[PDB]
């Protein structure tokens, strides 16, 4: 679930996903990664979410 975040980010930066599909998938993955206990994936998904949301 760490390569999925980078896959979504990479496909966003090439302009093949939108700010709507990407955020939906990344919040689903952050939900998975916050109920798993990983603090190294909570923050990974959080950084990806901040990048896709605003910037």
A 10 A CB-CB count for 23 gives: 17
Nearer to a copy of itself, 27 or 38 (CB): 38
Q: 29 CB contacts (<8 Å, ≥6 apart)?
A: 1, 4, 5, 8, 45
**C-alpha to C-alpha distance for 46 and 15, rounded to whole angstroms:** 20
- Rounded least distance, CB 20 to a copy of itself, Å: 19
Residue span 1-40 as binding mask against Zn ion, x where in contact by CB under 5 A, dash where not: -----x----------------------------------
Residue span 25-54 as binding mask against a copy of itself, x where in contact by CB under 8 A, dash where not: ---------------x--xx--xx-xx--x
């Amino acid at each position: 679930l760490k390569g999925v975040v980078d896959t979504v980010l990479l496909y966003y930066l090439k302009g093949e996903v939108s700010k709507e599909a990407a955020v939906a998938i990344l919040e689903k993955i952050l939900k998975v990664a916050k109920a798993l206990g990983d603090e190294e994936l909570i923050k990974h998904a959080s950084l990806a979410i901040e990048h896709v949301k605003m910037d």
